[PDB]
């Protein structure tokens, strides 16, 4: 049975005979029925690809018929073809998960379009994506080669992201491998770019992107100073650009995007440095000088982000803002639910700052790491898991609450993560699992890392003059020499951060108005 | 509140003045542009809610414009409004992720429809679903009351599942609690039904649903005997009917459903008993008798499902089948990947049996790992995480491989699981217990003082089984408060509920 089977329910089948003949010439098989009751029985006994429903029928309405049919077989698309132009009927139909609604008199080609849209869209998107990428990939490879500035890197990354999400679900493995290879080459070139240019960004009056320590003052404070709406400022820990893309469509049910500014995490691309920098408004070295009671170096025991509220309150004072402002750090579901359920207590704030931790992608427990790997083995899976997370997170409940109170939403992150593949040995560390190491006696493969023997020049502390930082490039992960083989097999294909990649370093900043 | 902003690109803006006036009366703000390139600039510098594109324009075509706009801001819906009736234009537009395509001359109300459908559908679905359930729930309560057979229980469960998935994205808490109360009432009645009928199902010539120990012979062997295609037989441990429902539409990309048979797990609704029964073709008591070298009772140490291949091979021999047949048990990602990558080795089998434990692992991890607790905090979340898992699982890769080799797919499970809520004291797994001198609340459990009557082993005449009903968990009187705190809202199985006991058996042909 090659031909598409349409069931068409309408009390006036006579009048539709032109459309039926037209569809039959175009190789559709139409079975007609002149009342809902019989249509339902037919629909139970046979396998239609699609149903067309009149609305105004003397027995059961189209929508009553649809409701019965959907209960039996909810995956079959249902199209309403009706003379009714009334808005309330439109709304009922839409609310009933109609796949389309065509107003009589209908152009027969409008029905054909609808059939293509509702039955062939998946195939046509795959084909079109596939052809378009076949024609595009060479131009992407060459654009990559010509990339010369941080802004070109942003534009190229945006291109890769766009194609990544489109090629997710195609089947051609050749095209998928071509893209994988472009991503590797992009990260190789980006690594060299950062290696060559990062230090110069700290010179006075340098051309540089917005970075962690600039973020609040350059992008958040203007929104505060508009004095238009209270602000919910959310930092999702460790979110990549593609993770944002994965739930863009969900958040749009509540919030309309007004502004999107890609910015660059500082190095290391890690919470202790970049996230504290967001809230302090200072590079780590300056946090060590100006706030020694809050700054902790890697060597010190305990939480590395305990004092973000204190940092943020001090920053807000230095910038001469007089606002009602609170900070929340959610590290678990329970915490998240409590804040969602109690969010209305903050109706009077100018600013609510929420740090919202994602899932731990790097467990030291094998069974937990097995769970993560089954859920997030590759980038597509990671996105899928992220989308599931966001739809069902207390974070989204917090956002809905904020929307109902007319808050503006600022959504951003401290840095992303990258799926690591290639091990690189490091000795001496005396530390966890990140794509940076710091210490006074490090040995390493210098080709694999960006090496900074003078940390203070990029705003990082140094215990003494032997302190160095190394930052992994590409998809390297830094592996300890002891138990090397087991380490490599464990941490291969995990989401790590701390180093240089488009994924880790170029991250979204987003401003939205409540819908 | 704030007006919807439309950007409309057409080289003949003059001729669209009626449509624009109509939309403006209906509170749309229209910005017009007569060529794609200027439209692109506008589209970069402003946040439009939606774009209308003509196709035939001098300069950039609609489709060229669309391509540029989607790259810049891919989440903004775009509608083509064009004189072009060409099929290839239709297909290109569709393939380019157009949200709609309206053929000129367009009824202005057709545009309005499109705007409502593409911008308001979430809200309209919520409202409509909510009112549909408000009008239906009384009829559901009545169907519940009229349930007198196992097949009626299957039909009613199907109805609850349908409404559960529909109500997952509504807001009204009253309506949500009404449904929760129908589920509780269904499980209370189902519990009594099972209590009253279960022993009698083992009487000769009893009218009874297919059960674990019948499953292979009654439902798998007829498929083997058609001798048409090899069979991939997948047992996903611990799959609830609603989890099947959550990924039905994914499977359908590869496999067409031929037959669905809901069946009943035996008691306890637990792997050691019900899963072994599937593979052995025997009740646990008979497994203890006929295969004491494989059967393990609860007290014995070590894995309780180590010998399923051997049980299955023996069953196949008893039923007089001569087939090439292998069994695989996937306990991790690595194992799953290996099997997907090397599946073609099994092209020559009549039967491949794959047990996949991951969903079982999730259900316990919801309590233990903070990752999964954040991801699977309620039933909606659990389904969502299951669907994300399935779409990106090695299991689905195995299924795709099987499809490419023309295998028939049989998909089933051993039992489901239920979110436990209410504690029930016992002193001597939390939905069944076995032992000789047990205290319990008889109202909360199904009590079997003679295990042999329901095909279960018995240490002594004193030894009995109790099976939790409803959403009870069996809690020890010592450390009761800590017990209750810890186990409330965890996934458990082993007892009686629709979730635990009525489970899918599914047969599909490769597409
Ligand atoms: F009588 Be109808 F809804 F065209
Ligand atoms: F900007 Be494009 F469609 F090459
Ligand atoms: F010039 Be068109 F495609 F209406
Ligand atoms: F496979 Be189980 F822990 F009943
Ligand atoms: Ca009619
Ligand atoms: Ca972080
Ligand atoms: Ca030095
Ligand atoms: Ca034109
Ligand atoms: Ca271009
Ligand atoms: Ca099981
Ligand atoms: Ca279990």
PDB file of C-alpha atoms in Angstrom, chain A residues 53-270:
ATOM      1  CA  UNK A  53     -13.003  16.945   9.179  1.00  0.00           C
ATOM      2  CA  UNK A  54     -15.855  19.324   8.447  1.00  0.00           C
ATOM      3  CA  UNK A  55     -16.917  21.175  11.617  1.00  0.00           C
ATOM      4  CA  UNK A  56     -20.628  21.941  11.143  1.00  0.00           C
ATOM      5  CA  UNK A  57     -22.387  18.574  10.772  1.00  0.00           C
ATOM      6  CA  UNK A  58     -25.940  17.759  11.969  1.00  0.00           C
ATOM      7  CA  UNK A  59     -24.772  14.942  14.191  1.00  0.00           C
ATOM      8  CA  UNK A  60     -21.444  14.999  15.969  1.00  0.00           C
ATOM      9  CA  UNK A  61     -19.374  18.066  15.181  1.00  0.00           C
ATOM     10  CA  UNK A  62     -15.959  17.785  13.526  1.00  0.00           C
ATOM     11  CA  UNK A  63     -14.330  18.524  16.864  1.00  0.00           C
ATOM     12  CA  UNK A  64     -16.386  15.895  18.687  1.00  0.00           C
ATOM     13  CA  UNK A  65     -15.396  13.451  15.976  1.00  0.00           C
ATOM     14  CA  UNK A  66     -11.760  14.501  16.271  1.00  0.00           C
ATOM     15  CA  UNK A  67     -11.830  14.007  20.050  1.00  0.00           C
ATOM     16  CA  UNK A  68     -13.090  10.424  19.659  1.00  0.00           C
ATOM     17  CA  UNK A  69     -10.608   9.653  16.882  1.00  0.00           C
ATOM     18  CA  UNK A  70      -7.606  11.062  18.768  1.00  0.00           C
ATOM     19  CA  UNK A  71      -8.388   8.864  21.767  1.00  0.00           C
ATOM     20  CA  UNK A  72      -8.259   5.768  19.517  1.00  0.00           C
ATOM     21  CA  UNK A  73      -5.168   6.773  17.498  1.00  0.00           C
ATOM     22  CA  UNK A  74      -3.627  10.016  18.716  1.00  0.00           C
ATOM     23  CA  UNK A  75      -0.688  10.007  16.297  1.00  0.00           C
ATOM     24  CA  UNK A  76      -2.821  10.406  13.181  1.00  0.00           C
ATOM     25  CA  UNK A  77      -2.894  14.032  11.951  1.00  0.00           C
ATOM     26  CA  UNK A  78      -6.292  15.676  11.671  1.00  0.00           C
ATOM     27  CA  UNK A  79      -7.094  18.612   9.397  1.00  0.00           C
ATOM     28  CA  UNK A  80     -10.221  20.700   9.697  1.00  0.00           C
ATOM     29  CA  UNK A  81     -11.763  21.904   6.428  1.00  0.00           C
ATOM     30  CA  UNK A  82     -14.705  24.133   7.246  1.00  0.00           C
ATOM     31  CA  UNK A  83     -16.656  27.201   6.173  1.00  0.00           C
ATOM     32  CA  UNK A  84     -16.526  28.466   9.792  1.00  0.00           C
ATOM     33  CA  UNK A  85     -14.461  31.681  10.095  1.00  0.00           C
ATOM     34  CA  UNK A  86     -15.454  32.305  13.740  1.00  0.00           C
ATOM     35  CA  UNK A  87     -12.459  32.883  16.007  1.00  0.00           C
ATOM     36  CA  UNK A  88     -13.894  30.740  18.838  1.00  0.00           C
ATOM     37  CA  UNK A  89     -14.079  27.758  16.485  1.00  0.00           C
ATOM     38  CA  UNK A  90     -10.501  28.457  15.380  1.00  0.00           C
ATOM     39  CA  UNK A  91      -9.396  28.436  19.001  1.00  0.00           C
ATOM     40  CA  UNK A  92     -11.274  25.273  19.910  1.00  0.00           C
ATOM     41  CA  UNK A  93      -9.816  23.457  16.904  1.00  0.00           C
ATOM     42  CA  UNK A  94      -6.280  24.608  17.660  1.00  0.00           C
ATOM     43  CA  UNK A  95      -6.768  23.699  21.333  1.00  0.00           C
ATOM     44  CA  UNK A  96      -7.879  20.231  20.193  1.00  0.00           C
ATOM     45  CA  UNK A  97      -4.481  19.656  18.492  1.00  0.00           C
ATOM     46  CA  UNK A  98      -5.759  20.016  14.936  1.00  0.00           C
ATOM     47  CA  UNK A  99      -2.788  19.771  12.558  1.00  0.00           C
ATOM     48  CA  UNK A 100      -4.297  22.374  10.222  1.00  0.00           C
ATOM     49  CA  UNK A 101      -7.479  24.371   9.633  1.00  0.00           C
ATOM     50  CA  UNK A 102      -8.473  25.301   6.042  1.00  0.00           C
ATOM     51  CA  UNK A 103     -11.358  27.688   5.417  1.00  0.00           C
ATOM     52  CA  UNK A 104     -13.837  26.959   2.610  1.00  0.00           C
ATOM     53  CA  UNK A 105     -13.844  27.607  -0.218  1.00  0.00           C
ATOM     54  CA  UNK A 106     -10.389  26.051  -0.308  1.00  0.00           C
ATOM     55  CA  UNK A 107      -7.942  26.137  -3.172  1.00  0.00           C
ATOM     56  CA  UNK A 108      -7.213  22.432  -3.885  1.00  0.00           C
ATOM     57  CA  UNK A 109      -3.492  23.248  -3.884  1.00  0.00           C
ATOM     58  CA  UNK A 110      -3.867  24.529  -0.298  1.00  0.00           C
ATOM     59  CA  UNK A 111      -5.067  21.018   0.657  1.00  0.00           C
ATOM     60  CA  UNK A 112      -2.118  19.515  -1.207  1.00  0.00           C
ATOM     61  CA  UNK A 113       0.261  21.796   0.656  1.00  0.00           C
ATOM     62  CA  UNK A 114      -1.367  20.736   3.917  1.00  0.00           C
ATOM     63  CA  UNK A 115      -0.930  17.051   3.023  1.00  0.00           C
ATOM     64  CA  UNK A 116       2.777  17.604   2.247  1.00  0.00           C
ATOM     65  CA  UNK A 117       3.336  19.677   5.375  1.00  0.00           C
ATOM     66  CA  UNK A 118       1.664  17.185   7.688  1.00  0.00           C
ATOM     67  CA  UNK A 119       2.884  13.915   6.140  1.00  0.00           C
ATOM     68  CA  UNK A 120       6.159  14.586   4.293  1.00  0.00           C
ATOM     69  CA  UNK A 121       7.736  17.382   6.384  1.00  0.00           C
ATOM     70  CA  UNK A 122      10.205  15.114   8.209  1.00  0.00           C
ATOM     71  CA  UNK A 123      11.568  13.589   4.984  1.00  0.00           C
ATOM     72  CA  UNK A 124      11.667  16.899   3.126  1.00  0.00           C
ATOM     73  CA  UNK A 125      13.573  18.609   5.972  1.00  0.00           C
ATOM     74  CA  UNK A 126      16.117  15.748   6.052  1.00  0.00           C
ATOM     75  CA  UNK A 127      16.579  15.889   2.264  1.00  0.00           C
ATOM     76  CA  UNK A 128      16.794  19.675   2.164  1.00  0.00           C
ATOM     77  CA  UNK A 129      19.176  19.878   5.144  1.00  0.00           C
ATOM     78  CA  UNK A 130      21.302  17.162   3.501  1.00  0.00           C
ATOM     79  CA  UNK A 131      21.525  18.889   0.113  1.00  0.00           C
ATOM     80  CA  UNK A 132      22.044  22.307   1.642  1.00  0.00           C
ATOM     81  CA  UNK A 133      24.931  21.022   3.820  1.00  0.00           C
ATOM     82  CA  UNK A 134      26.462  19.237   0.813  1.00  0.00           C
ATOM     83  CA  UNK A 135      26.559  22.628  -0.962  1.00  0.00           C
ATOM     84  CA  UNK A 136      27.667  24.563   2.153  1.00  0.00           C
ATOM     85  CA  UNK A 137      30.354  22.542   3.916  1.00  0.00           C
ATOM     86  CA  UNK A 138      33.185  23.584   1.589  1.00  0.00           C
ATOM     87  CA  UNK A 139      32.358  27.270   2.147  1.00  0.00           C
ATOM     88  CA  UNK A 140      32.376  26.612   5.903  1.00  0.00           C
ATOM     89  CA  UNK A 141      35.834  24.980   5.725  1.00  0.00           C
ATOM     90  CA  UNK A 142      37.201  27.938   3.869  1.00  0.00           C
ATOM     91  CA  UNK A 143      35.539  30.534   6.152  1.00  0.00           C
ATOM     92  CA  UNK A 144      37.165  28.676   9.082  1.00  0.00           C
ATOM     93  CA  UNK A 145      40.603  29.094   7.468  1.00  0.00           C
ATOM     94  CA  UNK A 146      40.078  32.864   7.011  1.00  0.00           C
ATOM     95  CA  UNK A 147      38.916  33.512  10.605  1.00  0.00           C
ATOM     96  CA  UNK A 148      41.119  36.260  12.001  1.00  0.00           C
ATOM     97  CA  UNK A 149      39.272  37.971  14.895  1.00  0.00           C
ATOM     98  CA  UNK A 150      37.220  37.168  18.020  1.00  0.00           C
ATOM     99  CA  UNK A 151      34.093  38.446  16.178  1.00  0.00           C
ATOM    100  CA  UNK A 152      34.705  36.133  13.205  1.00  0.00           C
ATOM    101  CA  UNK A 153      35.052  33.291  15.725  1.00  0.00           C
ATOM    102  CA  UNK A 154      31.641  34.192  17.127  1.00  0.00           C
ATOM    103  CA  UNK A 155      30.116  34.232  13.646  1.00  0.00           C
ATOM    104  CA  UNK A 156      31.726  30.941  12.625  1.00  0.00           C
ATOM    105  CA  UNK A 157      30.645  29.225  15.861  1.00  0.00           C
ATOM    106  CA  UNK A 158      27.086  30.459  15.204  1.00  0.00           C
ATOM    107  CA  UNK A 159      27.304  28.805  11.766  1.00  0.00           C
ATOM    108  CA  UNK A 160      28.524  25.486  13.199  1.00  0.00           C
ATOM    109  CA  UNK A 161      25.797  25.572  15.857  1.00  0.00           C
ATOM    110  CA  UNK A 162      23.166  26.169  13.187  1.00  0.00           C
ATOM    111  CA  UNK A 163      24.321  23.208  11.075  1.00  0.00           C
ATOM    112  CA  UNK A 164      24.901  20.980  14.138  1.00  0.00           C
ATOM    113  CA  UNK A 165      21.282  21.290  15.206  1.00  0.00           C
ATOM    114  CA  UNK A 166      20.025  20.705  11.647  1.00  0.00           C
ATOM    115  CA  UNK A 167      22.232  17.656  11.013  1.00  0.00           C
ATOM    116  CA  UNK A 168      21.335  16.087  14.389  1.00  0.00           C
ATOM    117  CA  UNK A 169      18.676  13.784  12.983  1.00  0.00           C
ATOM    118  CA  UNK A 170      19.793  13.149   9.369  1.00  0.00           C
ATOM    119  CA  UNK A 171      21.080   9.617   8.718  1.00  0.00           C
ATOM    120  CA  UNK A 172      23.983  10.254   6.302  1.00  0.00           C
ATOM    121  CA  UNK A 173      27.098   9.424   8.336  1.00  0.00           C
ATOM    122  CA  UNK A 174      29.467  10.910   5.778  1.00  0.00           C
ATOM    123  CA  UNK A 175      27.906  14.390   6.179  1.00  0.00           C
ATOM    124  CA  UNK A 176      27.830  13.946   9.961  1.00  0.00           C
ATOM    125  CA  UNK A 177      31.536  13.036   9.994  1.00  0.00           C
ATOM    126  CA  UNK A 178      32.362  16.030   7.792  1.00  0.00           C
ATOM    127  CA  UNK A 179      30.752  18.295  10.404  1.00  0.00           C
ATOM    128  CA  UNK A 180      32.526  16.531  13.270  1.00  0.00           C
ATOM    129  CA  UNK A 181      35.769  17.207  11.407  1.00  0.00           C
ATOM    130  CA  UNK A 182      34.921  20.909  10.923  1.00  0.00           C
ATOM    131  CA  UNK A 183      34.266  21.191  14.689  1.00  0.00           C
ATOM    132  CA  UNK A 184      37.656  19.640  15.436  1.00  0.00           C
ATOM    133  CA  UNK A 185      39.413  21.988  13.029  1.00  0.00           C
ATOM    134  CA  UNK A 186      37.459  24.971  14.420  1.00  0.00           C
ATOM    135  CA  UNK A 187      38.583  24.126  17.956  1.00  0.00           C
ATOM    136  CA  UNK A 188      42.191  23.549  16.812  1.00  0.00           C
ATOM    137  CA  UNK A 189      42.284  26.987  15.144  1.00  0.00           C
ATOM    138  CA  UNK A 190      40.402  28.666  17.982  1.00  0.00           C
ATOM    139  CA  UNK A 191      42.868  27.159  20.440  1.00  0.00           C
ATOM    140  CA  UNK A 192      45.779  28.705  18.532  1.00  0.00           C
ATOM    141  CA  UNK A 193      43.929  32.030  18.259  1.00  0.00           C
ATOM    142  CA  UNK A 194      43.380  32.201  22.024  1.00  0.00           C
ATOM    143  CA  UNK A 195      46.970  31.081  22.705  1.00  0.00           C
ATOM    144  CA  UNK A 196      48.242  33.916  20.466  1.00  0.00           C
ATOM    145  CA  UNK A 197      45.895  36.716  21.570  1.00  0.00           C
ATOM    146  CA  UNK A 198      44.581  36.110  25.089  1.00  0.00           C
ATOM    147  CA  UNK A 199      47.432  37.884  26.975  1.00  0.00           C
ATOM    148  CA  UNK A 200      47.077  41.018  24.823  1.00  0.00           C
ATOM    149  CA  UNK A 201      43.436  41.317  25.869  1.00  0.00           C
ATOM    150  CA  UNK A 202      44.677  42.367  29.346  1.00  0.00           C
ATOM    151  CA  UNK A 203      46.753  45.277  28.016  1.00  0.00           C
ATOM    152  CA  UNK A 204      45.191  48.729  28.628  1.00  0.00           C
ATOM    153  CA  UNK A 205      42.805  49.908  25.892  1.00  0.00           C
ATOM    154  CA  UNK A 206      42.954  46.484  24.191  1.00  0.00           C
ATOM    155  CA  UNK A 207      40.322  45.313  21.756  1.00  0.00           C
ATOM    156  CA  UNK A 208      38.681  42.382  23.552  1.00  0.00           C
ATOM    157  CA  UNK A 209      35.248  40.688  23.801  1.00  0.00           C
ATOM    158  CA  UNK A 210      33.098  41.179  26.879  1.00  0.00           C
ATOM    159  CA  UNK A 211      34.384  38.753  29.541  1.00  0.00           C
ATOM    160  CA  UNK A 212      33.311  37.275  32.872  1.00  0.00           C
ATOM    161  CA  UNK A 213      34.600  40.133  34.999  1.00  0.00           C
ATOM    162  CA  UNK A 214      33.016  42.734  32.708  1.00  0.00           C
ATOM    163  CA  UNK A 215      29.674  40.983  32.322  1.00  0.00           C
ATOM    164  CA  UNK A 216      27.665  42.504  35.144  1.00  0.00           C
ATOM    165  CA  UNK A 217      28.757  46.093  34.591  1.00  0.00           C
ATOM    166  CA  UNK A 218      28.530  46.144  30.799  1.00  0.00           C
ATOM    167  CA  UNK A 219      25.371  44.095  30.200  1.00  0.00           C
ATOM    168  CA  UNK A 220      23.405  43.724  33.444  1.00  0.00           C
ATOM    169  CA  UNK A 221      23.701  47.233  34.939  1.00  0.00           C
ATOM    170  CA  UNK A 222      22.200  48.955  31.838  1.00  0.00           C
ATOM    171  CA  UNK A 223      19.122  46.737  32.279  1.00  0.00           C
ATOM    172  CA  UNK A 224      18.921  47.584  35.984  1.00  0.00           C
ATOM    173  CA  UNK A 225      19.240  51.334  35.139  1.00  0.00           C
ATOM    174  CA  UNK A 226      16.262  51.236  32.735  1.00  0.00           C
ATOM    175  CA  UNK A 227      14.283  50.987  36.000  1.00  0.00           C
ATOM    176  CA  UNK A 228      11.396  49.510  33.912  1.00  0.00           C
ATOM    177  CA  UNK A 229      10.808  46.051  35.487  1.00  0.00           C
ATOM    178  CA  UNK A 230      12.406  44.053  38.354  1.00  0.00           C
ATOM    179  CA  UNK A 231      15.089  41.660  37.126  1.00  0.00           C
ATOM    180  CA  UNK A 232      15.499  37.938  37.536  1.00  0.00           C
ATOM    181  CA  UNK A 233      19.174  37.290  36.731  1.00  0.00           C
ATOM    182  CA  UNK A 234      19.803  33.553  36.224  1.00  0.00           C
ATOM    183  CA  UNK A 235      23.226  32.006  35.851  1.00  0.00           C
ATOM    184  CA  UNK A 236      22.894  28.352  34.817  1.00  0.00           C
ATOM    185  CA  UNK A 237      26.164  26.737  35.809  1.00  0.00           C
ATOM    186  CA  UNK A 238      28.127  25.184  32.966  1.00  0.00           C
ATOM    187  CA  UNK A 239      25.633  25.792  30.086  1.00  0.00           C
ATOM    188  CA  UNK A 240      26.853  25.566  26.431  1.00  0.00           C
ATOM    189  CA  UNK A 241      25.475  27.603  23.540  1.00  0.00           C
ATOM    190  CA  UNK A 242      23.802  24.474  22.048  1.00  0.00           C
ATOM    191  CA  UNK A 243      22.095  23.711  25.359  1.00  0.00           C
ATOM    192  CA  UNK A 244      20.544  27.203  25.254  1.00  0.00           C
ATOM    193  CA  UNK A 245      19.500  26.455  21.674  1.00  0.00           C
ATOM    194  CA  UNK A 246      17.879  23.183  22.806  1.00  0.00           C
ATOM    195  CA  UNK A 247      15.339  24.920  25.089  1.00  0.00           C
ATOM    196  CA  UNK A 248      15.027  28.315  23.333  1.00  0.00           C
ATOM    197  CA  UNK A 249      11.635  27.186  22.007  1.00  0.00           C
ATOM    198  CA  UNK A 250      10.322  26.228  25.447  1.00  0.00           C
ATOM    199  CA  UNK A 251      11.247  29.472  27.156  1.00  0.00           C
ATOM    200  CA  UNK A 252       9.533  31.405  24.336  1.00  0.00           C
ATOM    201  CA  UNK A 253       6.173  30.293  25.741  1.00  0.00           C
ATOM    202  CA  UNK A 254       6.835  32.578  28.722  1.00  0.00           C
ATOM    203  CA  UNK A 255       9.472  35.108  27.639  1.00  0.00           C
ATOM    204  CA  UNK A 256      10.241  37.087  24.493  1.00  0.00           C
ATOM    205  CA  UNK A 257      13.948  37.455  23.640  1.00  0.00           C
ATOM    206  CA  UNK A 258      14.940  41.164  23.315  1.00  0.00           C
ATOM    207  CA  UNK A 259      18.761  40.836  23.305  1.00  0.00           C
ATOM    208  CA  UNK A 260      21.357  38.117  22.684  1.00  0.00           C
ATOM    209  CA  UNK A 261      25.055  38.900  23.224  1.00  0.00           C
ATOM    210  CA  UNK A 262      27.682  36.144  22.918  1.00  0.00           C
ATOM    211  CA  UNK A 263      30.517  36.769  25.411  1.00  0.00           C
ATOM    212  CA  UNK A 264      33.762  35.047  26.380  1.00  0.00           C
ATOM    213  CA  UNK A 265      34.445  33.273  29.628  1.00  0.00           C
ATOM    214  CA  UNK A 266      37.844  34.039  31.119  1.00  0.00           C
ATOM    215  CA  UNK A 267      40.373  31.266  31.564  1.00  0.00           C
ATOM    216  CA  UNK A 268      40.187  28.869  33.235  1.00  0.00           C
ATOM    217  CA  UNK A 269      36.652  28.151  31.931  1.00  0.00           C
ATOM    218  CA  UNK A 270      35.639  27.016  35.407  1.00  0.00           C
TER     219      UNK A 270
END
